[PDB]
Amino acid sequence: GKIEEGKLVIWINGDKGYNGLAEVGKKFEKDTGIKVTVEHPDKLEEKFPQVAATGDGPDIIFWAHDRFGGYAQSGLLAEITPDKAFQDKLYPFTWDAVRYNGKLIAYPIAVEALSLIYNKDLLPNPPKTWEEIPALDKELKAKGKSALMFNLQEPYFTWPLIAADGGYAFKYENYDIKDVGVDNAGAKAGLTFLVDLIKNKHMNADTDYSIAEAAFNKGETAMTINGPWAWSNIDTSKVNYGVTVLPTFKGQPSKPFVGVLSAGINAASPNKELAKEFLENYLLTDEGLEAVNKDKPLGAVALKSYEEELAKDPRIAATMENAQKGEIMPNIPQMSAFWYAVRTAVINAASGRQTVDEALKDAQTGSELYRQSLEIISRYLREQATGAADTAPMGASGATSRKALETLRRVGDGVQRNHETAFQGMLRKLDIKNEDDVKSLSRVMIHVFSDGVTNWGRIVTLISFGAFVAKHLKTINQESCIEPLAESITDVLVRTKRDWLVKQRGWDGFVEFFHV
Numbered sequence: 001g002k003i004e005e006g007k008l009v010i011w012i013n014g015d016k017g018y019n020g021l022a023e024v025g026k027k028f029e030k031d032t033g034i035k036v037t038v039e040h041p042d043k044l045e046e047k048f049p050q051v052a053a054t055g056d057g058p059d060i061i062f063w064a065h066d067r068f069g070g071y072a073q074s075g076l077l078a079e080i081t082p083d084k085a086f087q088d089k090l091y092p093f094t095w096d097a098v099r100y101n102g103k104l105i106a107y108p109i110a111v112e113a114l115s116l117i118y119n120k121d122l123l124p125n126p127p128k129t130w131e132e133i134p135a136l137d138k139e140l141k142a143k144g145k146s147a148l149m150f151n152l153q154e155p156y157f158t159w160p161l162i163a164a165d166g167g168y169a170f171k172y173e174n175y176d177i178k179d180v181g182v183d184n185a186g187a188k189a190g191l192t193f194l195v196d197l198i199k200n201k202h203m204n205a206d207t208d209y210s211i212a213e214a215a216f217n218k219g220e221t222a223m224t225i226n227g228p229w230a231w232s233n234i235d236t237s238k239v240n241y242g243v244t245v246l247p248t249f250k251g252q253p254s255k256p257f258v259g260v261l262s263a264g265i266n267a268a269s270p271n272k273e274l275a276k277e278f279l280e281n282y283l284l285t286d287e288g289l290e291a292v293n294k295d296k297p298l299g300a301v302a303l304k305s306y307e308e309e310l311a312k313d314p315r316i317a318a319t320m321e322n323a324q325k326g327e328i329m330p331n332i333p334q335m336s337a338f339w340y341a342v343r344t345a346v347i348n349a350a351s352g353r354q355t356v357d358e359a360l361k362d363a364q365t366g367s368e369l370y371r372q373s374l375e376i377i378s379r380y381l382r383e384q385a386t387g388a389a390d391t392a393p394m395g396a397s398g399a400t401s402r403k404a405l406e407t408l409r410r411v412g413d414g415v416q417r418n419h420e421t422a423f424q425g426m427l428r429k430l431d432i433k434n435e436d437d438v439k440s441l442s443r444v445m446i447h448v449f450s451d452g453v454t455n456w457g458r459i460v461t462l463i464s465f466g467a468f469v470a471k472h473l474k475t476i477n478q479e480s481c482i483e484p485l486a487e488s489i490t491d492v493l494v495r496t497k498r499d500w501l502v503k504q505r506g507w508d509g510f511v512e513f514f515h516v
């Protein structure tokens with residue numbers, strides 16, 4: 001492989017305590033003579049899948065648990081195997097956070113939740129509601145202060161307001177992944193409130209992490225919204241601060257997405273046993289977690305013994321209070337796509353580039369794109385291969401899925417007829433005989449669909465070849481390969497054609513384009 005044997009490379013995000021982590025690395029090095037290198041690459045959560053897909057990158061990757069499902073789904077992570085005794089050392093619900101398709105795919109480290117951080121000298125009694133913040137800002141502006149500044153470039157920080165009055169990502173009721181609440185009335189109310197803060201000069205659409213942090217730590221703004229990792233810098237600034245429950249919106253609690261900081265092991269690492277040793281017997285201990293925490297606070301750690309100490313901290317009690325009012329992030333593979341969609345929506349709404357209504361509409365479509373495409377393509381491939389339709393209800397957004405499939409059947413019939421010779425030739429050239437061969441199609445399909453003008457014609461041709469291949473797989477008693485084929489084609493489609501698909505209003509555009 002490309003990853004070096006007999007050493008550890010560890011990537012962690014730039015806002016975390018990577019110097020403290022490096023100290024843990026140093027102790028491991030001292031014991032074993034094996035080098036540990038910690039890096040905090042820019043755009044880490046995008047850089048990791050890029051390099052890991054080529055079999056490269058770090059042995060150990062740190063991020064909140066939400067990204068790890070996509071990584072696991074892409075074959076980038078080793079299954080991890082803590083023995084029973086080690087597992088019992090961490091809270092069961094943190095392990096739940098790192099389970100994907102019934103397998104553990106990461107070590108959970110700490111539970112992160114946003115809180116309201118406030119300056120006790122400017123604001124001894126922080127607002128219980130978002131609604132009183134405009135008036136508070138007007139008072140403070142008379143003194144050359146502002147009420148509130150927080151990062152407007154990452155949706156994570158605005159989500160708690162979006163979800164307060166009813167917005168949600170993927171319906172969690174004891175998951176309906178088809179049920180997406182990104183553009184419902186509650187989500188629009190929350191984002192509209194944020195946009196009005198900006199229009200009324202109570203916030204600035206350009207504000208990012210660095211700018212908000214600096215304004216709070218310099219005592220220019222009375223409040224910020226941030227996580228435990230930020231407390232270290234505030235301590236240094238000597239601002240007299242407090243950490244408390246987020247304001248309510250429309251009488252409802254703000255609901256932060258709760259993240260579990262987690263460490264995965266690169267599927268292509270030759271050092272998996274070393275990584276296991278490092279994570280289990282050096283990092284996930286009282287002294288290991290302490291060393292990181294003293295650099296930048298981790299939040300509420302997954303390790304029972306050490307959390308029992310940290311829980312006495314009023315800042316941590318506050319973190320857990322907010323965490324309990326929020327929801328643990330899903331780790332389904334399309335979480336990245338969801339975050340990309342909401343990110344664009346908040347940025348576009350805040351800048352006036354789009355209205356709130358249209359911005360969230362696009363985020364809705366972007367977030368729904370994977371599951372809806374998979375439903376359409378899976379159903380088409382399966383019915384094409386068996387000759388009979390699936391009579392199960394389509395579920396949520398059923399009209400769209402049903403009409404798209406009806407359109408695909410009609411248009412797809414002609415494409416397959418006209419491409420029969422081409423399809424037969426390409427099938428024989430590719431030699432698809434089993435689930436292993438199916439795995440090899442992804443790189444091929446990506447290369448083809450990363451170039452050229454996009455249109456519905458070319459998309460239908462791909463799905464039609466999918467159906468052709470599915471029929472073949474059925475015929476040679478490899479009917480079990482059809483669903484991973486459908487998943488792979490869907491994955492290539494929504495990845496390479498994301499922006500174009502959203503601009504078409506997803507499959508609704510497809511239906512309209514081939515209307516009769």
Ligand SMILES: OC[C@H]1O[C@H](O[C@H]2[C@H](O)[C@@H](O)[C@@H](O)O[C@@H]2CO)[C@H](O)[C@@H](O)[C@@H]1O
Binds near residue numbers: 067154155156157259
């Ligand atoms: O903004 C979208 C972003 O939200 C979360 O990322 C957090 C991360 O969990 C925290 O540890 C901290 O570093 O701030 C990040 C936001 O800037 C999700 O984990 C992430 O996947 C998502 O893109």
Ligand SMILES: C=Cc1ccc(C(=O)O)c(NS(=O)(=O)c2ccccc2)c1
Binds near residue numbers: 444445458461463466
């Ligand atoms: C799924 C594998 C695969 C491989 C190669 C191509 C290609 O166009 O070169 C392709 N694109 S296509 O589906 O539109 C196609 C075009 C002609 C013949 C067969 C498939 C799909």
Ligand SMILES: [Mg+2]
Binds near residue numbers: 358503505
């Ligand atoms: Mg639109």
